[PDB]
């Protein structure tokens, strides 16, 4: 699709699409950039993540609206339309997972890139789990857990406890535990331990890094306040 466009042009257009709030375009541009086969820089990884987060975020919000209407009703139209949105959402998740598997993760050697992509893998399996029903749900849940766990193991070995990627991974894994895995106690323990270990490391940071880390720490605290 994007095979005729220069990598640098795809990246430039992804940034313009973000400014224009054209997130479907942004995701297509970044998919094209990934398919050029080169590794992604830190900024380019962020563009890929922002693009697909916005696309799947719109789909998840629509699926929740339709699922709530469908549950209140219980013609075929509400179910049929919820199913259509769900299939589209699953297709976006499968596209992202496919990019990670071909071949972003296998080429990611540095902790910052590998943790970033594995967190993404856990997130997109988590979005699949939100709409899955039955034993399909079990294997999807295990795939999310496995990706998050590998990312956690790397992050604890290779990054300081204030690193924003490490903090966001722990935040999202804690949400996985609470909302997906029916493990609220594990969610609370992870959020508390992550927060406390980051607090103890803030003294090492510059003013700008302090702002980055404390922003995410506040998200951990917000969840803990809602969960306790």
């Amino acid at each position: 699709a994007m095979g005729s466009m220069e990598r640098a042009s795809l990246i430039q257009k992804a940034k313009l699409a973000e400014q224009a709030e054209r997130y479907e375009d942004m995701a297509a541009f970044m998919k094209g950039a990934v398919e050029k086969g080169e590794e992604l820089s830190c900024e380019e990884r962020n563009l890929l993540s922002v693009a697909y987060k916005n696309v799947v975020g719109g789909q998840r919000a629509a699926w929740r609206v339709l699922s709530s209407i469908e549950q209140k009703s219980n013609g075929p139209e509400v179910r049929e339309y919820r199913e259509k949105v769900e299939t589209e959402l699953q297709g976006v998740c499968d596209t992202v997972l496919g990019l990670l598997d071909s071949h972003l993760i296998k080429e990611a050697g540095d902790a910052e890139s590998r943790v970033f992509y594995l967190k993404m893998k856990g997130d997109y399996y988590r979005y699949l789990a939100e709409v899955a029903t039955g034993d399909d749900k079990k294997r999807i849940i295990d795939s999310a857990r496995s990706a998050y766990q590998e990312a956690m193991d790397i992050s604890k070995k290779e990054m300081p406890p204030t690193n924003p990627i490490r903090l966001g991974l722990a935040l999202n894994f804690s949400v996985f535990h609470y909302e997906i895995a029916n493990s609220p106690e594990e969610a609370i323990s992870l959020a508390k331990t992550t927060f406390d270990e980051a607090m103890a490391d803030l003294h090492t940071l510059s003013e700008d890094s302090y702002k980055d880390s404390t922003l995410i720490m506040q998200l951990l605290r917000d969840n803990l306040t809602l969960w306790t």
């Binding site: 975020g57 935040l171 949400v175 909302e179 998200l219 809602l226 969960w227």
Partner: peptide, 9 residues
């Protein structure tokens, strides 16, 4: 609750 919002770069 809330995951990383992650929609702005």
């Amino acid at each position: 609750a809330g995951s990383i919002p992650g929609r702005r770069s």
